[PDB]
Write a protein that holds these residues in place. Structure first.
Motif, short mmCIF file in Angstrom:
data_model
loop_
_atom_site.label_atom_id
_atom_site.label_comp_id
_atom_site.label_asym_id
_atom_site.label_seq_id
_atom_site.Cartn_x
_atom_site.Cartn_y
_atom_site.Cartn_z
N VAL A 127 -4.67 2.35 4.73
CA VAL A 127 -3.34 3.12 4.82
C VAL A 127 -2.38 2.97 3.78
O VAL A 127 -1.28 3.99 3.81
N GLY A 128 -2.71 2.37 2.45
CA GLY A 128 -1.84 2.42 1.46
C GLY A 128 -2.46 1.69 0.40
O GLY A 128 -3.54 1.15 0.51
N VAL A 129 -1.74 1.66 -0.76
CA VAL A 129 -2.19 1.05 -1.93
C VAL A 129 -0.94 0.63 -2.59
O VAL A 129 0.27 0.97 -2.65
N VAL A 130 -1.16 -0.68 -3.56
CA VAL A 130 0.01 -1.37 -4.18
C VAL A 130 -0.53 -1.32 -5.55
O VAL A 130 -1.61 -1.97 -5.83
N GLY A 131 0.42 -1.04 -6.50
CA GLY A 131 0.26 -1.23 -7.76
C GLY A 131 0.95 -2.46 -8.24
O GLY A 131 2.38 -2.63 -8.40
#
Lengths: 335, 159, 31, 421, 134
Positions: free
Chosen positions: A76-80
């Motif tokens: 559902v999403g990505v984190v940098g």
RNA sequence: AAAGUUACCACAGGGAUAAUGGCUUGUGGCAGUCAAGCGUUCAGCGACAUUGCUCGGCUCUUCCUAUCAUACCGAAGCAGAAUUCGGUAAGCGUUGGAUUGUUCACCCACUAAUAGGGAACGUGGCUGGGUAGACCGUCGUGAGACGGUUAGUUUUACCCUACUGAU
RNA sequence: CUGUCCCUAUCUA
RNA sequence: AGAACUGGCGAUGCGGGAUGAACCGAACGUAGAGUUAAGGUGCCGGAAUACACGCUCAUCAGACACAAAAGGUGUUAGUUCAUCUAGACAGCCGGACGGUGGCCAUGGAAGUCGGAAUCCGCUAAGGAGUGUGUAACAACUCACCGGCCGAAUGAACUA
């Protein structure tokens, strides 16, 4: 005792977040480094032992392997994460503009009384002519040195009654962090098969909260067990998952009458020898050895001979209802 | 396990190709290793090393001088009668004393006969104590020069 | 490691010992 | 033991033994006390330290005494061999010196412990302990010479041969410088060159060989012409049950004339006459008749520079010492060639395949492709052996088609009659 | 000596002081366990033997010749349920053992009664003198 | 004829004590040469080797190294194996049952080995062996025996707090 | 012969 | 320890020594200004991270009489003696002899397993031989001199 495990206090949460991840080979193809699941009872396995040197070489051995329910995981999403002198820092995050009801409920403590306005504003701005999502993606590609992907479990596809999903971050071990986010973009709202992250004979290390015991405080603490081999990976739609190349009996790995304190296996699952921290219905996350632990035991394959699927409740003399009917025969209530 | 083979094996095959070099280097380094030990060793080991070095230096100096000389060319015992509760354990009683003759380079271990005059008390003489300076007689007069109470021996010099 | 603190009891004992040694040295002037 | 006393513990010199004992006393036992401590506590501490020192000294002395073999109480052959190398009286006196030192140490420790308990002050106890330690050091110090002698004899005895007089054996005797050791080289594993100078072998050499499967070994001797090297050979010749071979040089080598060698052999004859002697000769040959006057001695004319007669002498010495329904064989076995280990082209055994595959702990022998089958196509047997909880092995059988057909016929004959409804 | 592999941690049910029948024709009736060689010294734990283990025992019954003496003994029956590698748990009729020298040579010309498979596969000489293996 | 004498003077009278100042450890005592230098010039002393006989015994935890084993290194007639010493080294271990006239002398085995101690009246967290204050007076022949008077006090504590957890 | 113990686990008020 | 004498403590605040009963200073009514003692001037702490001459790099130095007699190829400053352009020390090239394998001890010892001699003959100087090894020599090394060599240096003691 063991001072290294102190303090023996309550865990921060049921989902024991992964403290460390395996090495990051920036040249390998993009792939996930961990997977979620739920413990589903346990079963006994008898298999041959192809292990030179051991006295039991070319011999059958009985062993106990745990069964974990692993419904397909959806991203559902990505984190940098950027690198800073104070450790890694999350500069920004992104979402898919579409969130399943499970995660939306996860953001609310009183769902039925809530207005369910989980992401209406963000989704509305997402549908513009870009410049809001591509900006964040470029910022992550530029500054972030390591990228983690946010995923959740399909609780609604699980026989549990929790009806709520658990968010979890997974590190990407493969290609450069630009390739990482490029691959993630193609997987937004998509599902990742369990067999893609692990394969048979691969060693994994589990991490979960053990059974609680109350005052003695005992139990309910996070624990890690390493060097657990995967014996078989199956699918919910793959009928006869419990049918070994030898047994070849069209029976599912689900025990007769269902698992104890658990429902029925109708999704992908992972079979690993030995036990795992926690109990049935507990959410468990799976890592892979944290390093190249490919010993001979890990290297050697495990050709399954038979899988136990009898009635775990009480006792059991048969693996399927057909065997019970044939052995016992017709009865008064049958006709 | 027959004979001196190790020497025979060395002769027939030789020692290590660098054995002599290793010994020479070790001997050369010994000059600095001695100083390092004298400066690094602490505790009892330092004391032992210093004492050994001093003894070696003294021996070397004595040898050099000798070469230069040639280059020119506790007490003593129904016998008690009137003594009160001053019982003396038998362990404190010794029958023999070490007697040496000042005029002769020979010493003889002989029994103690009788105490003549123990100083520091007439009662000490009566009881037969063996304090330092006591004059005694030995079966061939002698005076005790050491303190038997502190060493367990009775050394006496003939008068 | 050893403490370098000057203990009051130890310091005063040092002074007493020094005075006693000085007395003995003064009384030893017989040669 | 009796063969080779290589297990004797090293005899540390007086300085080394004393240093070791004092270090053990200082390290193992405590050394911290104060004048304000209980008087009985200080007395017990000092007594314990003194007793530990005495026990260490006693243990060292007892180990030295036990490890060393008492020459008088050893086999007469070994006794005389040790006597020749080391003066028996001197060795006994040295051992008695260690025994006396141990007794003196024990007496000193007991006397001081008895006296130490009566110490009325810490200083008196310390002085008594120091006096006891000084007495122990002086007792050890006096033993410097006997301790050094014991260490030397220990370091020398370990390399001595493990001679076995009881076993049948042959002794190589003769004049020195006659290549007597060349015969030893060519008859056993021993290794001593000709060394044209006489007294190369300062100690006896022993070598093993087998004849008619019976164990044998040969003993070499420096030779006889009254010295330790020559003396030790006399006792070896006498006490040993071995036969003795006399070596003679029929040439200018060694300078000794044949007449002198024969006269010496006759003169020493009264000592080895009962040993079943033999003579090996490594008007000149006329004198050999006089040598042959002894019925039991032969004349082996030979030359020890080669194996001209060593092979025959080896068997002769052993002989002298001793004098004192039908089967079924498959044709395949008879036709198959023997596995020549040295031939690189030899058939590759499982060892070679395992080596080419990896270590013994990683290569697993595969039984597939080895067992016979009707068709090799399905050699990868995957026999299920289980079907719906039923044992297939209980049903696997040929010609089951006929049984199935009979069962089908029975089913047909039962259905047409309306058995099931 | 005698052993032919590494120990397998089977269930232990024969602590020190136990008595077992001597399953051999050596004339001994029973063996009294005094110590278990090769075992670990745990806090207050009594050394426990098991099938295939070599322990020191004294003949408490039988002919006078073997009485009052101590010799190594090999356990052939434990009677306690233990998990074999072949799935099913099994236990023997009763405790039993044999007497042999440290080299594994049995004093009796032949063993009697059933013999544990684990002990037979670990002590070849025991299997040589065994007639009924399991 | 008695007076002195007595450091056994014993019984009573009376005077003041006796309740780490860095303590502590491995190499003795008396005797003689050998002698850095001091002795009024140096009247005396004196290092190192040398010589003559000579209340134990229980339990869990923490810590020190003066380390039995594990790890590494040097030396030793170290052929291999095994063994002895020395140096770094306290990270991890240092055993299951019996001895009771001083049980501490000391039993028979396992284990790689079964190292010694501190934890301020070190603790009973722990057990019992132990064997039993003073004052006065009466009868005291040189000698011991019966009064009577009395002290039997670190203590419960919903008091302080490290703790293991939990709001 | 016994859970005193190896070695503790379980149930009740 | 005993005999006599003198201060401190008490019937004494205050400043300094971080903290005090033996240490140093110090004539106590309440206040304002300056000058001082011990004690200090990098911060806590009011005062120069002032000037000058020398010293120590220390694997737990150091900032206060005793285990203290010595060792250290750890530094700097000195006393005595001796050599130094007749060539200081060091580094190499050569010699390192001849009686004689001196005399005894023996299976063997030509100097180096051992006992005492340790003599004479020639030299710019060379031993009955300082060390390595050979059964034994052999060779090699210094004890000692010369050749290249180019200036100061060694031994014992003091701070």
């Amino acid at each position: 005792g063991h001072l290294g495990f102190l303090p023996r206090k309550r865990a921060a949460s049921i989902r024991a977040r992964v403290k460390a991840f395996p090495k990051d080979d920036r040249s390998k193809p993009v792939a996930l480094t961990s997977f979620l699941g739920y413990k589903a009872g346990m079963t006994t396995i008898v298999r041959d032992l192809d292990r030179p040197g051991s006295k039991f070489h070319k011999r059958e051995v009985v062993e106990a392997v745990t069964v974990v329910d692993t419904p397909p995981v959806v991203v559902v999403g990505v984190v940098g994460y950027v690198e800073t002198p104070r450790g890694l820092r999350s500069l920004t995050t992104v979402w898919a503009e579409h969130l399943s009801d499970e995660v939306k409920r996860r953001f609310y403590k009183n769902w039925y009384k809530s207005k369910k306005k989980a992401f209406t504003k963000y989704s509305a701005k997402y549908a513009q002519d870009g410049a809001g999502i591509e900006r964040e993606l470029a910022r992550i590609k530029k500054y972030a040195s390591v990228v983690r992907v946010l995923v959740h479990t399909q609780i609604r596809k699980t026989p549990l009654a929790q009806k709520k999903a658990h968010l979890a971050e997974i590190q990407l071990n493969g290609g450069s962090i630009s390739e990482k986010v490029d691959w993630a973009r193609e997987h937004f709202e998509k599902t990742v098969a369990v067999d893609s992250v692990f394969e048979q004979n691969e060693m994994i290390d589990a991490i979960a909260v053990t059974k609680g015991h109350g005052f003695e405080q005992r139990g309910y603490h996070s624990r890690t067990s390493i060097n657990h081999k995967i014996y078989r990976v199956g699918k919910g739609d793959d009928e006869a998952n419990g049918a070994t190349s030898f047994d070849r009996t069209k029976k599912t790995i689900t025990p007769m009458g269902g698992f104890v304190h658990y429902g029925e296996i109708k999704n992908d699952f992972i079979m690993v020898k030995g036990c795992i921290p926690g109990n049935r219905k507990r959410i468990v996350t799976l890592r892979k050895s944290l390093y190249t632990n490919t010993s001979r035991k890990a290297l050697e394959e495990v050709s399954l001979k038979w899988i136990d699927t009898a009635s775990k409740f009480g006792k059991g003399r048969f693996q399927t209802p057909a065997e019970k009917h044939a052995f016992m025969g017709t009865l008064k209530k049958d006709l | 396990p027959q004979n001196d083979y190790i020497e025979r094996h060395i002769k027939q095959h030789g020692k290590r190709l660098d054995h002599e070099e290793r010994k020479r280097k070790r001997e050369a380094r010994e000059s600095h290793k001695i100083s390092e030990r004298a400066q690094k060793l602490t505790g009892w080991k330092g004391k032992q090393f210093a004492k050994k070095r001093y003894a070696e230096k003294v021996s070397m100096r004595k040898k050099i001088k000798a070469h230069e000389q040639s280059k020119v060319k506790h007490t003593f015992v129904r016998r008690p009668v009137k003594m009160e509760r001053i019982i003396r354990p038998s362990a404190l009683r010794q029958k023999k004393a070490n007697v040496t003759h000042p005029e002769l380079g020979v010493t003889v271990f002989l029994p103690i006969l009788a105490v003549k005059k123990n100083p520091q008390s007439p009662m000490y003489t009566q009881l037969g104590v063996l304090t330092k300076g006591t004059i005694i007689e030995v079966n061939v007069y002698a005076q005790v020069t050491n303190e038997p109470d502190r060493d367990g021996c009775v050394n006496a010099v003939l008068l | 490691r050893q403490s370098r603190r000057t203990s009051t009891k130890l310091k005063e004992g040092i002074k007493k010992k020094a005075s006693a040694h000085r007395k003995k040295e003064k009384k030893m002037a017989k040669k | 033991m009796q063969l080779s006393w290589k297990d004797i513990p090293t005899v540390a010199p007086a300085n080394d033994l004393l240093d070791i004992v004092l270090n053990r006393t200082q390290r193992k036992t405590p050394t911290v006390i104060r004048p304000g401590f209980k008087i009985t506590r200080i007395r017990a501490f000092y007594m314990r330290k003194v007793k530990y020192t005495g026990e260490g000294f006693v243990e060292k002395f007892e180990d030295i005494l036990k490890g060393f073999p008492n020459i008088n109480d050893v086999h007469p052959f070994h006794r005389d061999l040790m006597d020749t190398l080391y003066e028996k009286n001197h060795y006994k006196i040295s051992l008695a010196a260690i025994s006396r030192a141990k007794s003196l140490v024990e007496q000193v420790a007991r006397d001081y412990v008895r006296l130490l308990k009566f110490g009325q002050s810490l200083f008196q106890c310390k002085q008594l302990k120091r006096a006891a330690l000084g007495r122990m050091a002086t007792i050890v110090k006096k033993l410097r010479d006997p301790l050094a002698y014991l260490e030397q004899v220990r370091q020398h005895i370990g390399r001595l041969p493990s001679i076995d007089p009881n076993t049948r054996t042959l002794l190589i005797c003769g004049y020195p410088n006659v290549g007597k050791s060349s015969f030893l080289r060519c008859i056993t594993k021993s290794d001593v060159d000709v060394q044209p100078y006489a007294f190369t072998t300062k100690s006896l050499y022993v070598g093993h060989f087998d004849y008619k499967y019976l164990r044998f070994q040969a003993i070499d001797t420096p030779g006889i012409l009254m010295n330790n090297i020559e003396m030790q050979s006399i006792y070896a010749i006498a006490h040993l049950r071995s036969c003795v071979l006399y070596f003679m040089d029929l040439s200018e080598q060694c300078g000794f004339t044949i007449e002198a060698q024969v006269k010496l052999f006759h003169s020493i004859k009264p000592l080895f006459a009962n040993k079943s002697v033999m003579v090996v000769i490594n008007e000149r040959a006329q004198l050999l008749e006089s040598v042959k006057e002894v019925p039991g001695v032969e004349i082996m004319t030979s030359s020890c520079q080669l194996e001209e007669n060593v092979m025959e002498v080896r068997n002769k010495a052993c002989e002298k010492l001793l004098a004192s329904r039908t089967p079924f064989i498959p044709e395949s076995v008879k036709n198959l060639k023997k596995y020549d280990p040295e031939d690189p082209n030899r058939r590759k055994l499982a060892r070679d395949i395992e080596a080419e595959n990896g270590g013994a702990g990683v290569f697993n022998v595969n039984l597939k492709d080895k067992y016979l089958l009707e068709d090799d196509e399905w050699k990868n047997d995957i026999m299920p052996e289980i079907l719906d909880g039923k044992n297939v092995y209980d049903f696997l059988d040929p010609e089951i088609a006929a049984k199935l057909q009979a069962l089908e016929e029975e089913e047909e004959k039962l259905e047409n009659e309306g058995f099931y409804n | 000596n005698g052993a032919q592999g590494t120990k397998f941690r089977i269930s232990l049910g024969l602590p020190v002081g136990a008595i077992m029948n001597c399953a051999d024709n050596s004339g001994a009736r029973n063996l009294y366990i005094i110590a278990v060689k090769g075992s670990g010294s745990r806090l207050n734990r009594l050394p426990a033997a098991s099938l295939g283990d070599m322990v020191m025992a004294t003949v408490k019954k039988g002919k006078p010749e073997l009485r009052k003496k101590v010799m190594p003994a090999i356990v052939v029956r434990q009677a306690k349920s233990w998990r074999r590698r072949d799935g099913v748990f099994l236990y023997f009729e009763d405790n039993a053992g044999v007497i042999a020298n440290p080299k594994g040579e049995m004093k009796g010309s032949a063993i009697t009664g059933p013999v544990g498979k684990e002990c037979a596969d670990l002590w070849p000489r025991v299997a040589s003198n065994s007639g009924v293996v399991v």
